[PDB]
Amino acid sequence: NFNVAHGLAWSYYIGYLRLILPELQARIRTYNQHYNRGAVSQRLYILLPLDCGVPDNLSMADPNIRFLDKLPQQTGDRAGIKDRVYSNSIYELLENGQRAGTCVLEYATPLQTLFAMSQYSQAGFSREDRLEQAKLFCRTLEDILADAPESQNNCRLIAYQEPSFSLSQEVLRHLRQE
Template sequence: MQVRVNPDGSFRTPRLIPQGRSNYFEYCIVALCAVLFGVVSCYYDMQYVMFCVSTMILSMVVVEIIQRLVMLVEEYFSLQSRYDNSYKKLFLCVFSSTIPTVLFVTGALIITSFTWNKQTKEAWFFNLLTMIIYVTTEYLQLKTAPIYNSIQISNPKTMDVGAGMAIGFFHGYLRILLPNNPQNDRGLKHVMEIYEAKERIKFARRALYILVPLSLHCPFRLTDMSDIMEESSSLAAIEEDRAGVKNRNYKNSVYKIKCQRPDGKEGRIYVAAEYASPLKTFKESVESDGKFALHYQQHKTDILWKFYTTIVQLVKEDPLTDGLCEFIYYADFDKRGARVDIGKVLLKRLHADIAADKKKQEEQ
């Protein structure tokens, strides 16, 4: 019922949770182009076909360059406000491209130069037709169906609402809360050690567990979504002067989960856990009648997936936060619509993480 991160960084998703989209569509387009190229080559001279294809590609590049030149002129009037009077920033913003695109265009130029003797009026007609079709396609905006937005959101290289929420959550909360600094009683592990000594308990793991429910439902207490969890006192607050607010408090809740001990008696497992707070605001935006509400409703699961994958990556790639925070992206309602006990979800994940920690120690 919950997403798991594989050792290679990929994700295993249960059926109830929509997974990230693949590049099958792009592969199919490439395969179709290859088949069409092969079929046409059977009826025309190979060099002539290569000349037509390469010049068609260059025709689209010419149209794109003209479009970017127009944008360059428009952006020039915002040189100071947007680009700090830097012509370099302006130029890179307008004319930057990906390495595969540059290689593709370079290949087309090389092929055209070697097959230039194959030019005909028919070939130039195809080029003109290609330019007209390209411009028409851009003007008609054919790729405006919601599925194209979903594909764009799923792309790990693009910036969107989900990635923005994750970046803000990381730098505005986790990056403040997690790193250890014992000199001023800062850092999650240090605060948890103080809590253990004061309460005479032991945490199952010295890490913060953050819940990412598929429904976005984030009640005030985790105990509202569990029959086996109990509230405990909170961890000591961490104070930070931030954005004009003096002594802003950052603190985490502690819960006890009922479980069966090896001797058969009932015991308690202590865990620091909470919901991902940006999801509360996102849910309110989804359910509102405000601007972009329809967009959020259509792409709720895509945005949530982007938030989860981005925040996991950010925490793992930062040595000051890696290993101090675990995220549980789970389906909080089963196929029948019944509520899933979050205490059981946490318990299952804790046992899996403890076993993984032991295995890692044995390997070392």
């Protein structure tokens, strides 16, 4: 099942990142000018927990990550679905009670597929293989984005293992660099 994470990464690129990354800066600029608090950063920040533990509510993983607003939606006809909607959420990052950064932030959803596959007996995906597939997912995606025309300093991958751990501090480190 090595080809499992491989295909999921290509799917994530083909069916999502390549479609939304080109329009992202315009959506952010629209938000910055129309519905606004400091400036939203210019990159999509993608969280890649190698334990494939992907909560649906980000504030649950860390209270210092607080939902601010939704980006204006992106829509288009997709595979027979009229006006399919692509949604992204903006988060504020707090640090000792100060707003320290603002960004479009989400988990890489395919890591949730890896996790659920490892739970379903019919998937033939060993629970022991979650970390290995997660790593391959990250490496594949990294190699894809390194060479993708739509990636132009508008995407940032954040991969990490928890062994304390501060997810907000991990994100702020990448924001600081930018």
